[PDB]
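Re-running the complex after MR caught last week's input typo. The corrected sequence lines follow. Everything else is unchanged.
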Amino acid sequence: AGYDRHITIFSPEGRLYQVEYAFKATNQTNINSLAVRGKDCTVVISQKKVPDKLLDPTTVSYIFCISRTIGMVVNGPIPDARNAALRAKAEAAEFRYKYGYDMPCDVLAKRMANLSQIYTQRAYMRPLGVILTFVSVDEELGPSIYKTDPAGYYVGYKATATGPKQQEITTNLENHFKKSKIDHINEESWEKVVEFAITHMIDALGTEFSKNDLEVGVATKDKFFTLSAENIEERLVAIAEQD
Amino acid sequence: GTGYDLSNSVFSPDGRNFQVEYAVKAVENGTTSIGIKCNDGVVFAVEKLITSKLLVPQKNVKIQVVDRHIGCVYSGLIPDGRHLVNRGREEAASFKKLYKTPIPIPAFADRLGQYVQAHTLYNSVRPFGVSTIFGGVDKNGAHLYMLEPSGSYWGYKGAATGKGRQSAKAELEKLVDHHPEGLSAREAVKQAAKIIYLAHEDNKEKDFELEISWCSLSETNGLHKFVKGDLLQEAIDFAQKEIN
Amino acid sequence: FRNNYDGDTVTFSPTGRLFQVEYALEAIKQGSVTVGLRSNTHAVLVALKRNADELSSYQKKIIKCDEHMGLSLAGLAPDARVLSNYLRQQCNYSSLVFNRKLAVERAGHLLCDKAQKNTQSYGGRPYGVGLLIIGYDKSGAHLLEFQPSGNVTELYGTAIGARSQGAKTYLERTLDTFIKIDGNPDELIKAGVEAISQSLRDESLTVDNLSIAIVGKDTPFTIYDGEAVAKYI
Amino acid sequence: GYDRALSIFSPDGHIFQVEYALEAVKRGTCAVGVKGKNCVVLGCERRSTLKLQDTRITPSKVSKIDSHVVLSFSGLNADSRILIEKARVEAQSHRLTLEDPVTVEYLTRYVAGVQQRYTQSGGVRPFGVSTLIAGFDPRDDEPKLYQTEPSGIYSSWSAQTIGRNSKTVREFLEKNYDRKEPPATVEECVKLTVRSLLEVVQTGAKNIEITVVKPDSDIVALSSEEINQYVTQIEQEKQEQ
Amino acid sequence: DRGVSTFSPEGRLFQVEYSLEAIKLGSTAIGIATKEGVVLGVEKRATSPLLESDSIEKIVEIDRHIGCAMSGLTADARSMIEHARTAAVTHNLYYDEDINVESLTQSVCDLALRFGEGASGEERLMSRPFGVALLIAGHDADDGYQLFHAEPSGTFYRYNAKAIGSGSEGAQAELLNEWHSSLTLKEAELLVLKILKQVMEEKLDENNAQLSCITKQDGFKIYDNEKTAELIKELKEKEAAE
Amino acid sequence: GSRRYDSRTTIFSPEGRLYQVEYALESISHAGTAIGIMASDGIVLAAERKVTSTLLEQDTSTEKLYKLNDKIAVAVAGLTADAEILINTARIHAQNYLKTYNEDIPVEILVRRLSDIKQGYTQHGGLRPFGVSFIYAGYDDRYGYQLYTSNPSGNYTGWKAISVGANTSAAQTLLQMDYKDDMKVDDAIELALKTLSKTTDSSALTYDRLEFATIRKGANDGEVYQKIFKPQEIKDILVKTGIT
Amino acid sequence: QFNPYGDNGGTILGIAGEDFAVLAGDTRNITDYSINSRYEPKVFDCGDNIVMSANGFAADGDALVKRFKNSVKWYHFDHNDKKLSINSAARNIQHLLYGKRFFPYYVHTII
Amino acid sequence: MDIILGIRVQDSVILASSKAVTRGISVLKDSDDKTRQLSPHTLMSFAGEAGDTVQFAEYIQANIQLYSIREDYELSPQAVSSFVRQELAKSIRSRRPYQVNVLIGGYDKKKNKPELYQIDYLGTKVELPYGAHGYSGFYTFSLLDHHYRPDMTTEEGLDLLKLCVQELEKRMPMDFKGVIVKIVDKDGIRQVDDFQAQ
Amino acid sequence: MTDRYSFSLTTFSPSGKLGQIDYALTAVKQGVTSLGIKATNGVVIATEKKSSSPLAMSETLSKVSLLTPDIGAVYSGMGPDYRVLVDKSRKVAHTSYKRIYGEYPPTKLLVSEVAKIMQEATQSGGVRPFGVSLLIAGHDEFNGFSLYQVDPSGSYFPWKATAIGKGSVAAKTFLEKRWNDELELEDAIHIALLTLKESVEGEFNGDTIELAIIGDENPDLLGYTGIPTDKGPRFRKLTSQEINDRLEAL
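Corrected-run output:
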């Protein structure tokens, strides 16, 4: 009856409210992230917001190293994001062991999607209020970005963004692509693609960034890594001499 | 409609988990305790309200060790905290058995997070009614951590929780601003005694028993030990002094 | 309000209260009175036993857990049994597996952990009884107070049950005195009896009415009931 | 997994589901059993939600638990099936291990306990059935009549009934059955059983079915006709006045 | 709705209180305990004159040295008695002696609170408290003749005399007055019989009241109708004076 | 907790009725009408299909008449899926009886077993019943031609002619009107069809809207034949009767 | 293969008098040809005026003696301080012993 | 082993089974009935391992009796046997197989014909004019292969059994103490009380 | 801890309705249109690719899935619910059939299997029905070509043609006029394309249409040569190009 708004069962309009609310939860952190694919790399930027001075700034991240190859950034509270990280790690390991090759991004995405689908269908499992963007330079497919949500949806993008100002970034991004006509930043070094990444997050959020305001992650052939405040700064500098 | 707060795993229309938040309240209604990270260790201290003179002095200990290099202190529903330490212990052992080396702090923390976060996933269990400040020394540094009923945790330069939370963080923020160099575990012990003392003012009614403990790479060898005797009085003194 | 959040122990109120646990604590306040007080050499328990009719027995409130430990109960007796039985087992295990008398401090820690499971688990129910635990071990005499909330505290003395507050205040003053009753069992008992009398109203403590237990240095946890407590009124 | 306490206590000391099961009993056709001096008769009225039935096959109301014990009921038909089977098995099991068929009492106590059990186990609702179990104890000639209810309570009767309007027919039995001289014959017992049934069955030959149980495994169900003869002669012990 | 092991704001277990209520509607059972034996008498309470009164079992033997009277939803007592019997026989097997009555009683009460729906404490597999109370009386060498009242709460008390069931408060009050240390088996039989008479709606006779006693010499004996009738008669005369 | 969302599907009303059962029966009454008529040399099962269109393929369709074994078949009224679950298991219990005793299973045993599976959902488990009712048409060496019916309460009974689904009272009344103990298969078919004709909630009884089945013990053979009528044959039998 | 058993020698003797009884046992404990101890008691006081010895494979004898003392401990607990009569102790032991009928306590015991 | 013979005449089945139970060095009993009536027209004879023998028999009895009541019908002999076979065939792969051999002689009231089935502890079943288990068959099958006729009377079958018994008493080493004969026909099951001297 | 939700979440209302099931049917209604037309020598199933942003990559999402080399399924309703049903359906085709008979299951049986799962979600304790409806099209040596629709209740039925979701009714109506029993696959494709066009709100081309067929055997897609019994898979997903070529013949 009127409990159809507590557990994942259908409402008379054919909706799962708990899933809906879970989506709203992803915004609680107030961080925006984007990801774009280079010619042979994949960058994801996510803002970093350290309010309290009493925290050790380096322990704050919503970007996670899943496997030597896959990188994942979460938009959502941390206890749910970490819970998803661990599992994504457990899964990527198991896949390597059982199949003899590294789990690809899309498959890892898909697998992560399916578990979510499950919380969507069983009363006892609450969905996780987080959206996961997996990125890597798959050995078979190239730079990749696959994102999943609490509804169990997942898909691949030419570039994406997520967070409170998703729409603004998306539109700026879409525009850049209509202009270029290609599906990736036509750039050789990931350093530059990281620049475009930040540059456009600035142009769209109408904000300037300091080194401790971003979190950057890159994924190249046979490796994914997070940038250091200093590598980030090298970028911040490079752009502040272009714009 | 309403009712989104009668069950622990239910998301509200605003995307919050009300039972987790009501849990936090049980925390706030509790004693204060803090953690000050330092140049090669961490110090923990907690206010211990003296309910009556019938209480035997220095006996109802509250800080807890995990393994041999980790201190744990929490404010709130004491038992929930103890429960959280039993798992910590078990998870520490499991790590050592399989890997030989004692559990690294970041890793210990996450093990804690994950168990707590798990208590916000089902409506057949209630979240934890405690926030925990814990840390210690490992292969590469000192680590201080605080965990909330939501399972959120992060690394701290200093941390505090409980009723005196605010004044405590006030003091702590002072320390971080004034001493960017770090603090000697010797100093931090004092400072902790202070912060607790000040923080007792937000509850200036009942008298208190101070309790500190530390883990320092040169003062305790990386092992968690409590502060007793000579070293304890020094801090109690340094405290009662700067209270005025 | 309350009526919505008191349905079970797995629900926190908007204040951060656990009503089922709180409600549990009430059955204790409903129970008869018992007092504990320790010196540095002995620990005594004096508890007022409560009959149902003038035609019945006075519910036994003290239980021996080991030769070195025991407790007086206040509240729901069954839950007392379940808990003392658990205390009996843990004492047994220490003796058997380590040939070590269980530390009261540890016995305490164990009781807290047992109750707590019934205060965070569905369909379960907090225990409805408070416990006064005394014991002598490698570090002297001890007295522990256990509450269904899971909270256990070691005190020089205390009292629980209906009107407990009388004795609890009495001891709070009588402290400096009794804590020094070393090497004299009967006195501590007396001190206990006096204290217990501070929470009376009904009638004076009698033969069928009183229950005292003592543990100490060269004294194994022994239960004195009726015929033998006569000299302590 | 499913273990919800369905039978539970309510503020006044009642177990509703148990009580509501009694209602389903009241809603079922009447069943009567009266015991003679050398027999026991069990009669039952016939349902009427629809008619065009195949009288040949439909599971009648009286069932043999064993060659010397029968059980009739009033209530959820389906619910009764479970009790019968369970009773039959125990009838066999008892034979296998004691090398002696059950006494009606044993069989009664068995069925009874199964009912009680369902009133305090998780995940289940009480049996919506009450039964009349009759027959003779092995090698004995003293007739046995017992009744059981969803609560699980049981006991014996010189005569008794359950089901809709049992309140009315009980009265007839209470008045026409004298414990000083129970229907001293198969005939008069059958008659008294029919008379009683008539008071409520409301003149319907094909509405009544009667069964007689004699000592040493002699159990016989009357023909639609032999009963009709009883209905006939009975309407005369009312008309001749 | 709420669970079956929920505590009221007054600190009591609902289902327990509720069952205690159901117990108030039962046939009276009285037991008196003297230095010559223990009497347990009960009111059959036939719900119709066609029911064969002797087929009412409300006083059962647990062992030769322990008997028991029930009051309440008497079907719930079956599994209790069984456990009581097995508990006593088993004890004799493992120790070559009789189980102490307290011990037997205590074993029965251990069942009491084992109800719930996944109550994290052990494996409680019973959906609701017992809707019945027992009067357990017996004798052992250590503590003589004893009478115990066992309630669905897990608690049990020892009484010199006790009444349970519908006429409890009244009967209890009467017992309270009439009872004394130097009572005799016959006097006790009488009181039970008398007090039963009082609280009984229908007129007490041999087919509706049942007496039984347990003594060191002959053990648990359920009085046969003829013996009880003689006592009933012996009573009309004791009462028909002053 | 979890109890919060439990409907208690196996409880009694104050009136001693089973909600879920009563409510399932109601579901069934909105289902296509199925009829079973027992003759002296056969049994006819006929059913009116619900949910039709110009595009629905009637050729390779069987949504109401199912074969349980070579001597027994059932007509369904209710949820087609819930049906298949019970069918697949009934088919199996048939084969088990066979393997165990090397004799085909007596119709009533098969029936009683199925009815017992339904009674279960009525008394324990906490699951919704199956919204299905069956008319079984079967033959056996002990009773010959048999027609039974089972519904959600797990109760079953035998019949000379019967119907389930929508308009039972209407159809029943019509059947009580024209049925007679000494009927014949070709006649029962007609009756079956007529009855459907006057209860149909549609304009005209067309072939595509029907499913017909007969269980005849042909004289020149010995083996009970089961013939599930093919579309063309329904059309034919329909013209013969004159509905056209 | 692992042989779960061993023999530690020793010998015990018990004699019942009119108002007394004794249970004597030697004090040597061996293994094959070596003396393990010249003084390792195997006759113990189990409380309630009951002495017992389980001689054979010491590990088993020890385990047995342990389980019995404990049975005496719990008899007190469960049956309100009642003293375990010797006849009762005996029967109790029968059960302790027979519980291991399919992996026996390789010992010959006396109380 | 003990003796279990069965012979199907025209209107009946006659089972003959030895009266001795020997254990070690002594014959404990000389009047054993190694038979159980499964149903009024079905009798089963059994032999094999000490306990398994009666235990399996009585179990099969219970199960057939139960079915009889649940359906107020008597399973055909063929049915009872297939049932028994499967119980055996399932046993052969259990932890401790029933080591029992049985002959089932029943009168099929529907077909109005006597039947006899031989089933071994492995669940090997076969229908036969006459059968035996153990060593007896080693003598009797040839004897019967020669003296048996499909149209014999109950009396003729009994005499044939007599021959069998004699041959067995002559040549078998163990004193089995005679046999108990039972005839299964249209009117039920009866034991020939006169075989120790006919 | 533990899934204590052991009771049905779909029960009967007093009107005899199974709420959760009707509701799932609504969810289906809100889903994009998908159809399937059956030819004499083929079957086509198609649907629209509702690109939820131009940044997303359309190709990386198969709404049309191959279940066996001769069977496909398309849907309308909640995609995730679908994706997991394909996984299971693909697995069951092996566990309950290819691992026992050495050959792929026939359409109706596979369908029968899928349907059973859906039913379970309607009665098992602790779950909610699937919010999807599928159109499964296949072929098998003994039944020829078929097309089935499976609803959240678990009911399935064969069709000459049908459509589900948003523009169902209009589409069902459009098909009823064009369809006939002498349609050669190309023509049905065509019809499907037309039918699809009317539901499609904006862009219409091979990058927004996912149309697949079940037709003749295709050996060039087998991947190996040398065995004359395995003639090739009959299911083929049409390419963007192949769709456009037929679009440019509107």
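None of the earlier attempt is carried over here. The first strand of chain H starts at residue 4 and ends at 8. The helical segments of chain H are 50-71, 77-91, 137-147, 154-171.
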